[PDB]
Design a protein around this ligand. Structure first.
Ligand SMILES: CC(C)(C)c1ccc(C(=O)CC(N)=O)cc1
Length: 209
């Protein structure tokens, strides 16, 4: 059973701006997603100090980068706190409304798209390089869900029947045809070294078989 939702108008407008604006410095999408993963890992680490059972779903706190040239996907996996169904459908987009407005006004005033993370809506920078984004997520207090959107004003949410993840989030970037450089090991290494060198969790870049 698949549920289809409309983005709020302001978020759809943000997504269109990211997709349509000419802006060559697309590589910053990875910094934003890794920063998001680091934030989710910080949250489960903090919560597990006052409740160690919150790590019964997995003790390891890490980030994995998995390219797949056959599927033309780049997957960012973390074992952070995960997201509830309410997070996916309503809470996070509601919060993003204010950051989107502030980001819009900053852009009109001289800012550029690389500053998106200073406004708290860095997830949507995924559409700099992806034609479709799939988010698989598992929070301790909810079931495993799959969120998905190719923009165009709508997204879907369904219960995920695939491999159980334990806890955390996978962001699967279905890359645009002209953005396959982000599947190359040397290119991902360069970007992580440039923009994510001090992330406080191990980042493992998987190799293709
Ligand atoms: C579309 C889903 C529900 C996956 C999502 C996730 C995160 C955010 C943010 O705006 C927070 C951030 N980027 O750190 C907004 C929406």
């Amino acid at each position: 059973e698949v549920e289809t939702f409309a983005f709020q108008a302001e978020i759809a407008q943000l997504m269109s701006l990211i997709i349509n604006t000419f802006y060559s410095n697309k590589e910053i999408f990875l910094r934003e997603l890794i920063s998001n993963s680091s934030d989710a890992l910080d949250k489960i680490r903090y919560e597990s100090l006052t409740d160690p059972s919150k790590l019964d779903s997995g003790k390891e706190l890490h980030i994995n980068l998995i390219p797949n040239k056959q599927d033309r996907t780049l997957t960012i996996v973390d074992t952070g706190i995960g997201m509830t169904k309410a997070d996916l459908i309503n809470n996070l987009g509601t919060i993003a409304k204010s950051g989107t407005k502030a980001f819009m006004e900053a852009l009109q005033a001289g800012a550029d798209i690389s500053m998106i993370g200073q406004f708290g809506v860095g997830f949507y920078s995924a559409y700099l390089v992806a034609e479709k984004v799939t988010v698989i997520t598992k929070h301790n207090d909810d079931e495993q869900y799959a969120w998905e959107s190719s923009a165009g004003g709508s997204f879907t949410v369904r219960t995920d029947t695939g491999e159980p993840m334990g806890r955390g989030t996978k962001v699967i970037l279905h890359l645009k045809e002209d953005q396959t450089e982000y599947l190359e090991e040397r290119r991902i290494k360069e970007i992580v070294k440039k923009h994510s060198q001090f992330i406080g969790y191990p980042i493992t870049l998987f190799v293709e078989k």
